[PDB]
Ligand SMILES: [Zn+2]
């Protein structure tokens with residue numbers, strides 16, 4: 209479905225921070241909380257792909273884009289961060305902050 213890919217693409221392109229998530233997903237919640245802790249709400253969109261008729265197609269496309277079909281799937285300015293574990297690694301190592309500084313999102 210070109211439609212599914214167009215829709216996922218629009219989410220990633222229109223929002224600097226894009227998080228694909230699902231219902232009652234602890235690592236989704238943890239990742240979103242970390243990101244909101246950088247006061248990124250204004251530039252973030254969270255998409256619940258479980259409440260969607262095309263969940264399997266969305267997951268398959270996220271795997272084509274990132275190598276994994278699991279949520280959360282995290283993009284920052286169209287770059288693949290990955291899952292919550294990847295976010296925690298980048299955060300602890302300083303990379304996340306560096307990303308956000310280069311985007312003008314944190315001073
Ligand atoms: Zn579920």
Ligand SMILES: [Zn+2]
Nearest residue numbers: 230231232233
């Ligand atoms: Zn429940």
Ligand SMILES: [Zn+2]
Nearest residue numbers: 253254255256
């Ligand atoms: Zn949405």
